[PDB]
Write a protein that binds this ligand. Structure first.
Ligand SMILES: O=C(O)CCC(=O)C(=O)O
Ligand SMILES: O=C(O)CCC(=O)C(=O)O
Lengths: 458, 458, 459, 458
């Protein structure tokens, strides 16, 4: 009699459902056995973590590493320190990580870990001691050839460092055992740029396919929402490829271009400085360059979608549910043909459904083409693979090298979606395949066939 | 945020209760910290087990090893294969194992493991393939100085053989990694006898103490339940000591003696053979000697306790929760003055409360005296420690040497419980000390103190 | 080379070497001169940084050391010392001696010594825990039940051994005999507290028997002891149990003497033990019974007991190193003392040792004072550590009587080996007592050097 | 108390003094804690080395490995066999190695080891046996992910081969555990070239910065001293980049170009053959091509500095203390703007002082710019990292690939010095940053911040 694990059960049921609404099990019914094998994790470690607080008292938390699947590579996935953490949640997140990592084409398996340790209110001294204790036990079960964790909620650069330092001390090895490391001790260039550059490259690959290699970002008008790092670097990449960035935004309003034109790199760097100083877009229109009313128009309380006029590409990069069903319709009437999520779950289900029905109802490049976040914002995962690659040679690559490689990985990510959809949700003649359906299946099918090849099931 | 683990949480709450109801936390209030720490397992491993059935189909089950505590020694405790198995249950069994193992005097930590694999209806080949697969993963986490498992429900000598065989092949070490091994490949004499002998030995000390050296098993009437190896060898040792054995039973009914007789060794040998053949007591009453209705009465559907009439000692040795509140009172009315669990968790908390209430109410030899399983049925795990001792010595001791050490262990276990109750749960004059409270405190403090010494808490 | 100056170690090497030269050993086996040169260089030395957090939350740095000197006879064995004086030279000195002390027990134990310059003085239990955790995080790599088995020494008692054991078992994930001096319920040995003290006395029993042709024992002898910790206590109680009289104890502040005939009783030693548990002085118990009975007890502040004991038959220095000067050696000689053995490690100064030895070689029969070296006479401690390792591998706890029995046999064999080896290689003049110093040094060295040769460490 | 370690204490004091004469401890006083922690080695192994001489006699020597710091990478640094070897000396060298290695921007820590073994007058056989015995112990402590030694005085190709053979045998792994290996068994192309080429690339980066990327080696006149591997390859690189090499020299004299012109690659090759035959430059001037007195002038007993006329770059690449105070002033007067040490400690302190005062007194490209050897001759170390990178993939890069990558590493070495001087020894407006000060501080700052991130100090 199995324990109640609602978050994991939900995630399994969603996969099994998306697999069922496809021809996968008509063509390959034996993959139902794969579904059953894959959803029992290969290994789970749980361990007590004892650590000393600043008053000198004994404290107790619970440590976790779910090593869910390793058919395609060593276990890969983040560590989460948050009071809500438990096996059920970490299984949900680790299970999903299998298939998102699989989607990229990198040799990365699937895992998730962490603790119910709550870093809110903790001194750095406390976080250090917790991390030291935590890694003392975890060290046994991980390694560059076995399991390579990373950060998540509660585990950023600071914690990764403390974790790395203690691993090194116990194991007496310097290796790529974590990703998200500092620039001087095995971190990668292009790490801040990864997500934003990643979305723009994915969309480039979409355009290329949709137009049979005749169009790129060159000459295209691109609406971006957000003004954090993802939006800034997506904007910079667009510009670098010859596109026009016509909008940026924050939670209070949108800053948009009047008529023809684009934001410039300099302007983007000014918006970055204002973002570092916690200031809102509303406050920078007072001075130049943004006080020029012939180039720039600030719109209070608005998202950009209905205000940019005619537009070719939309790149939501702010927050979740920032494209309504209604806004999807306007982008469609604005002639938008490509949309990809920079923000996690940026499109509402109504918007996704809209873009998909439009796709189904319109042959070729007359359709709007939506890419889901698990595919289009896999840049951060992509650069993690490159950080590992780089670590194996104790050698850093140039910005240009990491960038070029990030581009190729997003192509693999794209193609896995495209081809899976073509095979298992085959569209009508001249209709673009669904990247949402393709991306939801493709991880499972790559992992399942790998598992079969390796005798994990038969 | 934690998962609901009721079997485990109840055992914890109940131990905490017996510790509160004593002077232990008055004289050492710090030990409450130890309680919070010890209750979180050092390490838990869970893992997928894929195995092939006789049709050649893939089958999936879940593997577990709870390494609960190692302050006194390497993790020690059985493997259970039963479809009820899960983490909560093994946490429950593993927690109890800590304190049982502690009480043997031997350097043995507490652990428990197994699988939801059901051996019912499986071929021997299927069981072999399952054990090969199970041990392939488990081998990484165990070892002669790390974790030493053994049998339990679903895991007999047969399974231990398959498990050992696989370990030796992958680890390339021949060592005391398991106990309950076969005689020619590192098994110990007296291991089959140990639990049953051990409870009888323990109870002999109870009789001695409660009667001020007046009495022994000589002339006592002893009601036993069950008919597996515990009940058998308990029966045989009672007979050796001059007691009468007046009942045995299985899951279908009770075989009782009429009048003032007793089972014989020869009759016990016959019941043992009927049990190897997985037959029932109801199948053997229709032929001699058990068809003799002057001596024997078979009672279908019944536990033996009402049907034995007046008895002096009760040795439940069948199954968990086989003595209820009602039956505790039946045994009190029968003139029963000693009860000790041969089986794991034989008495309900209601029966325990009933017995303890009776002890408190009735000074001296009038009291029914109850010994907890962690003390009284420690004989088995004790002889496992001796199997480990023998493997490390690279010798096989005679039956007489193993048996001698088992007697010293059960003696010291009784003395410790008795003296610890005298110190921290001091009874009124003439009142028997609580073996429940004394055994719990003794076991707990030995672990907690060792944990403090080793810096696990402070 | 330009080797670093390591005076403590270099001095011990030369003294050892000299005692070997004053024998037939290198005449009979000149090739052992190469053995000696090879044995003098440690097999392995590990040094390491130990970073640890104080109670104020500040980072602190100390240096950690393990000298794995020799392993021909067994895994490296020897204690850990936390004391501000600790460095490589000092640990090499103590590790070198440990080789030969361990060899004389007859058990399979090699020779090692380690520790840190961490100063436990003034540190909280918590600080001590944090230091041990961090220290063992690095040391774990280099030690093990079949590799190197440390123990306590100055600055490392049961408390530290516990924190050190706990951290090892956590990182290594093996429960094993990696340390000795462990606690009773987690693989310690009975008799370990008594070992060193009982051991000296057992050894001296054989000295007395040999010197007097079995005509005397401890019965009726007056015994002066210095110190008031475990060694002094259990030595005293064993002497009392053998029918001798203990006429002094002492601590770093003064000595507490018996006046006239008479002895400390076990009850008095028990009280003294309780006060030394409380970290009090012998000073601050004299004004309270029974130690205020100024007919039986005299206290002298600032003094060692040797000049105040009157006539004495046996002396058992059991406080600290270098606690019998050459002058005090003469005082004991003139007091009529005939038997001396060290309860404290390096109790006698070299000057005292040269005096006892001069006096032995100048006097026939039992008119001579007989000095036993520490490597023979206080091996009781490390012997029972060896027994602890044996118990751990047996996965059993022996009884008091069994550990004690074996301790007795070990000390007896150790005495015999020193005696007979001196008779063979450093034969005394007719009627002179065999030198247990030369005897023990030769016996220890040759056991190691011959085993090294069998194992191809030299040829 | 502590042992007397004079060479190490000196090296420690010089670092502490450099760090005090900067703004580092004003801006970041907590880095004093870093200095105290970093100056205690992480680990030191000493060991007895017993080996057999050619007469069959036992010999005894002392082996050492100082594993000083691993924050930025596995321990890296050479092995020295010389009768002066001891812990103090090896700590001195390993301490310096941390910060030099750090300076390259490669993921390499800092270490040094060796023995007091004297190879003077030993047979190849004796050297083989010593190495076998030495590596038998050392193997335990090192490894491709832990510690990667190399050569030094007493340890060249021959010894590296013997050491690697024995490691392979015992460890049964083929990996990059040593650098300086033979071409066919893991050595890198560009290895003989590395130091010489490395010096020239470093100067290229200096030229680019000083001139706004307006100038290069193209059209420059370059005075080089020495005529061994470093001068030869430095020369060849200069010629490849369009520069003129106007001198070379040996201990007895200088061979310089008469008027404008340059040595050619064919001429460099001739000088290389003569140097292999162990002939001095004085004796190659009696034949063609060097007898042509219109092109070549031999100056007996002179260094080249005062005899080359106007020159843009100076590359002392012969020995130590080969540019006097006077010669530094002559070079300044000859229009020399770039000076960098091919040879270890080639510039006297008077010369370094003179170049630094000139820099201070002369805004921008008017200055002569001195690069210290720890930065400019770090190419040997750079190619070591590339050898490690190539060993990971069991794959040799092309000469062009190794060479291009060496150039980049020398840019990182440059940037680390430049930027560090900018921050902590900030020059007046328009004045070049001190590469000597920058290079002496930059390694420490990189290591200290990585140490802090990793919880080594806090
Ligand atoms: O011998 C063993 O280790 C298994 C015994 C056990 O699990 C028990 O005491 O219930
Ligand atoms: O118990 C041990 O291992 C030896 C302690 C020690 O170093 C000694 O004999 O002084």
């Amino acid at each position: 009699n199995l324990p109640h694990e609602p978050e994991f059960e939900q995630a399994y049921k969603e996969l099994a459902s998306t697999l069922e609404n496809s021809t996968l099990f008509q063509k390959n019914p034996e993959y139902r056995k794969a579904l059953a094998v894959v959803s029992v994790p290969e290994r789970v470690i749980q361990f007590r973590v004892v650590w000393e607080d600043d008053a000198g008292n004994v404290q107790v938390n619970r440590g976790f590493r779910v090593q869910f699947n390793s058919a395609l590579g060593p276990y890969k996935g983040g560590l989460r320190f948050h009071p809500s953490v438990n096996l059920s949640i970490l299984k949900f997140l680790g299970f999903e990580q299998i298939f998102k990592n699989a989607l990229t084409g990198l040799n990365m398996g699937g895992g998730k870990g962490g603790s119910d340790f709550d870093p809110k209110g903790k001194s750095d001294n406390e976080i250090r001691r917790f991390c030291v204790s935590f890694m003392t036990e975890l060290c046994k079960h991980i390694g560059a050839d076995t399991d390579v964790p990373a950060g998540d909620i509660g585990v950023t650069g600071r914690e990764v460092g403390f974790l790395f330092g203690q691993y090194r001390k116990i194991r007496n090895q310097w290796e790529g055992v974590l990703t998200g490391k500092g620039g001087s001790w095995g971190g990668s260039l292009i790490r801040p740029e990864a997500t934003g550059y990643g979305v723009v490259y994915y969309v480039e690959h979409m355009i290329a396919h949709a137009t049979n290699g005749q169009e790129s970002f060159k000459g295209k008008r691109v609406a971006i929402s957000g003004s954090g790092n993802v939006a800034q670097y997506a904007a910079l990449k667009v510009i670098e490829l010859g596109g026009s960035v016509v909008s940026l935004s924050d939670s209070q309003g949108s800053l948009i271009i009047n008529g023809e034109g684009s934001f410039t790199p300099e302007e983007i760097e000014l918006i970055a400085q204002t973002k570092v100083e916690r200031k809102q877009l509303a406050s920078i229109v007072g001075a130049a360059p943004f006080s020029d009313a012939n180039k720039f128009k600030y719109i209070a309380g608005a998202r950009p979608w209905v205000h940019v006029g005619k537009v070719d590409v939309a790149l939501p990069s702010a927050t979740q549910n920032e494209i309504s069903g209604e806004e999807a319709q306007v982008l469609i009437n604005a002639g938008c043909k490509f949309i990809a999520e920079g923000s996690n779950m940026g499109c509402t289900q109504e918007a996704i459904d809209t873009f998909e029905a439009h796709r189904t109802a319109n042959a070729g490049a007359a359709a709007i083409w939506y890419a889901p976040g698990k595919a289009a914002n896999a840049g951060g995962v992509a650069v993690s693979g490159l950080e590992m690659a780089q670590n194996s040679a104790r050698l850093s690559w140039t910005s240009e090298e990491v960038d070029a490689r990030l581009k190729d990985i997003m192509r693999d990510c794209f193609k896995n979606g495209l081809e899976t959809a073509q095979e298992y949700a085959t569209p009508a003649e001249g209709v673009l395949p669904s990247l949402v359906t393709g991306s939801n299946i493709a991880g499972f099918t790559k992992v399942a066939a790998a598992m079969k090849d390796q005798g994990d099931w038969w």
